[PDB]
RNA sequence: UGCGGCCUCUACUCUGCAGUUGUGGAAGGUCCAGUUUUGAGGGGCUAUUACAAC
RNA sequence: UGCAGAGUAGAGGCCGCA
């Protein structure tokens, strides 16, 4: 078999990127080894899989972890492993599949790495009909070809390509006989490669595709651009972009190294502006492919970026804005600062929660001595000596369940509140002063913008102090219908139990009703499950029915729960014994069950459950009170609330739940005073409405234009009632005005929809009752309607959130850079903005910490839209070693980007210099030709040795050549002192020049 | 070779759920509707945030 | 990470028709 001509003609590029490919693979395998505490197919992680399929599994938990992460870091492995299963019958992918795919991929990658990085070696593996070809290479070519079929299908989903745009590939890959691979196709992944046996091998394009599975997207683009693989399509063609996208769609995801940026007022401003240019995710799903495409932008460094919001970062951004701005004197937000682990066999975790400004808390979290706060306990990064320790995590705000928790300090400039640790075991936390809904944060921001943060803060603190005064009075039993108004809290902001208590209507929930209802519901479900079966459930239910004693200390604990859920005469005994050991105050029915298999056990469990619940129902029907179940009459839920007891729980035990519409009255009073707001009826004006009116009437602004684009919703499809030829519902894209009108007419339109839809269901014989169909449609319309309504409500919220970020960011930058804003407007903001604030040029400075060092990257002038460049540079593996060479931790952004592009151009030229050196050595010394012919491994290292001994090179020169060559293979810079260098951006160029000169002979 | 129906398998996207006990439904989630394109309001349901103890 | 539903795309088997 001959090496493909593409490979032979582009050897320097295949050489470079094959090396990069194999290093990237090792990196992933190494990472998995570390995290899971245990010739790349002999790697510990790969050995594990090899043995996992064959022998009895000693840790299935580890096997399954390895298989899950391998598929995370190598996304193509999902497709190839699924094809390997089918190839082989079991339903699911097994360690053998994963092992076989990767053994072959690695084997062929290694082969081509060796051929392309060596002037001459005699490769036995290329001999026609050999073991390597028959067992590894030829199977892989077929696998790769089948992989690509699916990759092209994924292109439709990922980038919204249509059949017409992919047909230039999809229609021409295979040729029909009676089916066959069209080896004449320009992008054919298989060829005969002059094999006399006439078996399909990987083609050159095939080898390029294999390599690109193991590259980053940036390097896929650099690599493929140097190959003539695009027939006649030109640099700017859509076809070229399709080809390149197809070669990256499922490529390696590398584990990313830790970065910690220093934040500032300016940085937070810029984080907010770069957030508002992105599409909200709830909006993006509703948009046509055309308009979704408008968020796919090309960066400065010619990289495609999807400008879409991962998540709603409005609230954290606002908290950073307040902290770094030092805008609240007394309020501090709830931060987590890691976890305490102690050994006490299980390990127990406790979160290290506290309150302070994110910066100040972070300064306290990690001492110079590497201990936490004032604790003494080591921050790490079955041995009792290793415990206790604290998991290393950067201070972040706690934001769960749509809440923001706070602590109110009496005095200004208070220190961070970190938890005390006791007995190296207990983390003594603080109940937050109060808790606010994340939905309240827009109005707070608006209040802050209109009045100032200090006035905003005074209002939060005053509201908090009113609730406290109320709860104190409850504890003295001094709250009446007569005096409730004096506490200054509106009825709609008081708990219902207080309102019940003052009205003389205090009651618990009715236990008897609840038990009667629960028993009936559960009996019905039991029969549903019995029927479904004849036609973690069990672990949850077994514990549900386990009686509690001694504050619940008797019930099944975490580890034993996991074992129970996961869990021949002896085998039967063993299974029964488990429930004896778990002491199942007994489970009410389980003992009746006691068999041969899980399936028998589930059936018997359900029958016995049915008999138990029937008994209970029958006793309820006799009017009897029963008590056996998991409902517990002594819980306060079921008792009447008392003023004094509830007063104490509200004051001492819980945070104050702050009300919604805290800031409304003050916002409205302000706006009423402005003459621009003269028209507005403030009796029908919510804060979402008023934000929009403010920016249109006071600021001559409007929301981003992408909130006006047409949107798709299934429910609106159903209401529009338009069908294709075959009779499927059409996907409409409506305007808001259209949907307003459909919604008004939803009753009529739903009637029509159901009539037609029912008729279409009846066509199928499998489904044949009438009421069966009515239920199917009921659920169809409810679910769809609910999805639509929620989506539209949330998008409206994103609009005003963006208004607020824009306003705050603009305020920061106006005062800071001394730039000329005032003219800038949210309506101008767009993902690729060519005008307005995002296009303004400003000096910038980005400071970050990586691998225990602290660096700064500057710009004397930079468009605000490009602020994301800094993270791309900081993330780069080379940044560390490069700045070691520069001899400064402070550097220009432009210089580093130029350096990195020049490095990228030098790397293949290094490969070429090596090649020509090896060639010289082979031409001079004929001993090596013999060593090749008798199949002996010659390396660069070997050639250097011959050059050294026969006095062509000296040790110094040998060491330099070796070290530079190694640095480039690593995709990194060499250590300081190896070679004399120039300044940025010519460091890589100067290293290349040295290598070139040290590779000339004596 | 084209078209229609039925069955099986695979992929992608979107929505819902996950130690024990206690406390808490002014908040959050969800459901209903002659409600909202103004996270506003009404009615039902529900321990989700947190903290203590194991 | 395990489980359920809906929409979309693709492949295989069977039948009828041109
Ligand atoms: Mg309200």
PDB file of C-alpha atoms in Angstrom, chain A residues 15-138:
ATOM      1  CA  UNK A  15       3.855  15.696  10.365  1.00  0.00           C
ATOM      2  CA  UNK A  16       3.091  18.778  12.471  1.00  0.00           C
ATOM      3  CA  UNK A  17      -0.585  18.082  13.105  1.00  0.00           C
ATOM      4  CA  UNK A  18      -0.264  14.299  13.550  1.00  0.00           C
ATOM      5  CA  UNK A  19       2.114  15.067  16.458  1.00  0.00           C
ATOM      6  CA  UNK A  20      -0.351  17.613  17.801  1.00  0.00           C
ATOM      7  CA  UNK A  21      -3.118  15.015  17.454  1.00  0.00           C
ATOM      8  CA  UNK A  22      -1.319  12.295  19.429  1.00  0.00           C
ATOM      9  CA  UNK A  23      -0.267  14.735  22.192  1.00  0.00           C
ATOM     10  CA  UNK A  24      -3.853  15.963  22.576  1.00  0.00           C
ATOM     11  CA  UNK A  25      -5.025  12.330  22.906  1.00  0.00           C
ATOM     12  CA  UNK A  26      -2.439  11.556  25.609  1.00  0.00           C
ATOM     13  CA  UNK A  27      -3.485  14.716  27.449  1.00  0.00           C
ATOM     14  CA  UNK A  28      -7.098  13.505  27.695  1.00  0.00           C
ATOM     15  CA  UNK A  29      -6.078   9.987  28.702  1.00  0.00           C
ATOM     16  CA  UNK A  30      -3.749  11.442  31.374  1.00  0.00           C
ATOM     17  CA  UNK A  31      -6.519  13.672  32.719  1.00  0.00           C
ATOM     18  CA  UNK A  32      -8.949  10.776  33.054  1.00  0.00           C
ATOM     19  CA  UNK A  33      -6.295   8.683  34.851  1.00  0.00           C
ATOM     20  CA  UNK A  34      -5.740  11.465  37.423  1.00  0.00           C
ATOM     21  CA  UNK A  35      -9.434  12.180  38.089  1.00  0.00           C
ATOM     22  CA  UNK A  36     -10.356   8.453  38.283  1.00  0.00           C
ATOM     23  CA  UNK A  37      -7.235   7.343  40.235  1.00  0.00           C
ATOM     24  CA  UNK A  38      -6.508   4.658  37.575  1.00  0.00           C
ATOM     25  CA  UNK A  39       1.391   3.161  22.173  1.00  0.00           C
ATOM     26  CA  UNK A  40      -1.638   4.887  23.658  1.00  0.00           C
ATOM     27  CA  UNK A  41      -3.700   1.672  23.763  1.00  0.00           C
ATOM     28  CA  UNK A  42      -1.425   0.526  26.630  1.00  0.00           C
ATOM     29  CA  UNK A  43      -2.241   3.675  28.657  1.00  0.00           C
ATOM     30  CA  UNK A  44      -3.598   2.842  32.198  1.00  0.00           C
ATOM     31  CA  UNK A  45      -7.033   4.196  31.176  1.00  0.00           C
ATOM     32  CA  UNK A  46      -7.026   2.007  28.027  1.00  0.00           C
ATOM     33  CA  UNK A  47      -5.649  -1.055  29.859  1.00  0.00           C
ATOM     34  CA  UNK A  48      -8.500  -0.680  32.365  1.00  0.00           C
ATOM     35  CA  UNK A  49     -11.057  -0.937  29.526  1.00  0.00           C
ATOM     36  CA  UNK A  50      -9.197  -3.817  27.908  1.00  0.00           C
ATOM     37  CA  UNK A  51      -9.468  -5.843  31.136  1.00  0.00           C
ATOM     38  CA  UNK A  52     -12.929  -4.536  32.163  1.00  0.00           C
ATOM     39  CA  UNK A  53     -14.748  -6.397  29.363  1.00  0.00           C
ATOM     40  CA  UNK A  54     -12.790  -9.655  29.781  1.00  0.00           C
ATOM     41  CA  UNK A  55     -12.439 -10.297  33.536  1.00  0.00           C
ATOM     42  CA  UNK A  56     -15.084  -9.868  36.246  1.00  0.00           C
ATOM     43  CA  UNK A  57     -15.404  -6.140  36.969  1.00  0.00           C
ATOM     44  CA  UNK A  58     -13.718  -5.091  40.237  1.00  0.00           C
ATOM     45  CA  UNK A  59     -14.950  -1.473  40.116  1.00  0.00           C
ATOM     46  CA  UNK A  60     -17.918  -0.948  37.740  1.00  0.00           C
ATOM     47  CA  UNK A  61     -18.107   2.610  39.122  1.00  0.00           C
ATOM     48  CA  UNK A  62     -14.634   3.306  37.643  1.00  0.00           C
ATOM     49  CA  UNK A  63     -15.335   1.516  34.335  1.00  0.00           C
ATOM     50  CA  UNK A  64     -18.523   3.552  33.830  1.00  0.00           C
ATOM     51  CA  UNK A  65     -16.730   6.792  34.794  1.00  0.00           C
ATOM     52  CA  UNK A  66     -13.976   6.118  32.195  1.00  0.00           C
ATOM     53  CA  UNK A  67     -16.576   5.326  29.497  1.00  0.00           C
ATOM     54  CA  UNK A  68     -18.606   8.486  30.286  1.00  0.00           C
ATOM     55  CA  UNK A  69     -15.663  10.939  30.304  1.00  0.00           C
ATOM     56  CA  UNK A  70     -14.004   9.412  27.204  1.00  0.00           C
ATOM     57  CA  UNK A  71     -17.243  10.242  25.382  1.00  0.00           C
ATOM     58  CA  UNK A  72     -17.177  13.808  26.803  1.00  0.00           C
ATOM     59  CA  UNK A  73     -13.623  14.616  25.672  1.00  0.00           C
ATOM     60  CA  UNK A  74     -13.863  12.609  22.442  1.00  0.00           C
ATOM     61  CA  UNK A  75     -17.407  13.436  21.095  1.00  0.00           C
ATOM     62  CA  UNK A  76     -16.886  11.379  17.936  1.00  0.00           C
ATOM     63  CA  UNK A  77     -16.619   8.252  20.108  1.00  0.00           C
ATOM     64  CA  UNK A  78     -20.418   8.198  20.682  1.00  0.00           C
ATOM     65  CA  UNK A  79     -20.987   7.689  16.951  1.00  0.00           C
ATOM     66  CA  UNK A  80     -18.134   5.260  16.370  1.00  0.00           C
ATOM     67  CA  UNK A  81     -18.861   3.119  19.457  1.00  0.00           C
ATOM     68  CA  UNK A  82     -22.524   2.836  18.445  1.00  0.00           C
ATOM     69  CA  UNK A  83     -21.412   1.642  14.977  1.00  0.00           C
ATOM     70  CA  UNK A  84     -18.986  -0.826  16.657  1.00  0.00           C
ATOM     71  CA  UNK A  85     -21.839  -2.350  18.715  1.00  0.00           C
ATOM     72  CA  UNK A  86     -23.900  -2.884  15.548  1.00  0.00           C
ATOM     73  CA  UNK A  87     -20.797  -4.299  13.828  1.00  0.00           C
ATOM     74  CA  UNK A  88     -20.212  -6.911  16.587  1.00  0.00           C
ATOM     75  CA  UNK A  89     -26.614  -8.856  20.221  1.00  0.00           C
ATOM     76  CA  UNK A  90     -26.830  -6.385  23.140  1.00  0.00           C
ATOM     77  CA  UNK A  91     -28.643  -3.022  23.069  1.00  0.00           C
ATOM     78  CA  UNK A  92     -25.941  -0.874  24.670  1.00  0.00           C
ATOM     79  CA  UNK A  93     -22.330   0.221  24.200  1.00  0.00           C
ATOM     80  CA  UNK A  94     -19.849  -1.845  26.231  1.00  0.00           C
ATOM     81  CA  UNK A  95     -16.174  -1.301  27.179  1.00  0.00           C
ATOM     82  CA  UNK A  96     -15.166  -3.608  24.286  1.00  0.00           C
ATOM     83  CA  UNK A  97     -16.724  -1.211  21.765  1.00  0.00           C
ATOM     84  CA  UNK A  98     -14.999   1.824  23.196  1.00  0.00           C
ATOM     85  CA  UNK A  99     -11.678   0.000  23.483  1.00  0.00           C
ATOM     86  CA  UNK A 100     -11.775  -1.294  19.875  1.00  0.00           C
ATOM     87  CA  UNK A 101     -12.658   2.062  18.321  1.00  0.00           C
ATOM     88  CA  UNK A 102      -9.837   3.851  20.180  1.00  0.00           C
ATOM     89  CA  UNK A 103      -7.277   1.051  19.731  1.00  0.00           C
ATOM     90  CA  UNK A 104      -7.695   1.361  15.945  1.00  0.00           C
ATOM     91  CA  UNK A 105      -7.851   5.166  15.844  1.00  0.00           C
ATOM     92  CA  UNK A 106      -4.681   5.391  17.949  1.00  0.00           C
ATOM     93  CA  UNK A 107      -2.902   2.651  15.994  1.00  0.00           C
ATOM     94  CA  UNK A 108      -3.370   4.320  12.588  1.00  0.00           C
ATOM     95  CA  UNK A 109      -2.697   7.790  14.027  1.00  0.00           C
ATOM     96  CA  UNK A 110       0.591   6.502  15.477  1.00  0.00           C
ATOM     97  CA  UNK A 111       1.539   4.906  12.137  1.00  0.00           C
ATOM     98  CA  UNK A 112       0.994   8.134  10.141  1.00  0.00           C
ATOM     99  CA  UNK A 113       2.667  10.184  12.895  1.00  0.00           C
ATOM    100  CA  UNK A 114       5.787   8.002  12.452  1.00  0.00           C
ATOM    101  CA  UNK A 115       5.806   8.108   8.606  1.00  0.00           C
ATOM    102  CA  UNK A 116       5.267  11.883   8.377  1.00  0.00           C
ATOM    103  CA  UNK A 117       7.848  12.803  11.088  1.00  0.00           C
ATOM    104  CA  UNK A 118      10.733  10.754   9.615  1.00  0.00           C
ATOM    105  CA  UNK A 119      12.787  11.185   6.449  1.00  0.00           C
ATOM    106  CA  UNK A 120      13.058   7.416   5.960  1.00  0.00           C
ATOM    107  CA  UNK A 121      11.865   4.409   7.897  1.00  0.00           C
ATOM    108  CA  UNK A 122      10.903   1.092   6.247  1.00  0.00           C
ATOM    109  CA  UNK A 123       7.340   0.521   7.482  1.00  0.00           C
ATOM    110  CA  UNK A 124       6.420  -3.183   7.492  1.00  0.00           C
ATOM    111  CA  UNK A 125       2.829  -2.086   8.322  1.00  0.00           C
ATOM    112  CA  UNK A 126       2.321  -0.808   4.730  1.00  0.00           C
ATOM    113  CA  UNK A 127       2.957  -4.272   3.187  1.00  0.00           C
ATOM    114  CA  UNK A 128      -0.235  -5.421   1.423  1.00  0.00           C
ATOM    115  CA  UNK A 129      -2.255  -8.079   3.268  1.00  0.00           C
ATOM    116  CA  UNK A 130      -0.284  -7.664   6.525  1.00  0.00           C
ATOM    117  CA  UNK A 131      -1.802  -7.986  10.018  1.00  0.00           C
ATOM    118  CA  UNK A 132      -1.753  -4.221  10.675  1.00  0.00           C
ATOM    119  CA  UNK A 133      -3.731  -3.467   7.500  1.00  0.00           C
ATOM    120  CA  UNK A 134      -6.189  -6.386   7.868  1.00  0.00           C
ATOM    121  CA  UNK A 135      -6.797  -6.013  11.631  1.00  0.00           C
ATOM    122  CA  UNK A 136      -6.489  -2.254  12.253  1.00  0.00           C
ATOM    123  CA  UNK A 137      -6.166   0.050   9.237  1.00  0.00           C
ATOM    124  CA  UNK A 138      -8.779  -1.387   6.842  1.00  0.00           C
TER     125      UNK A 138
END
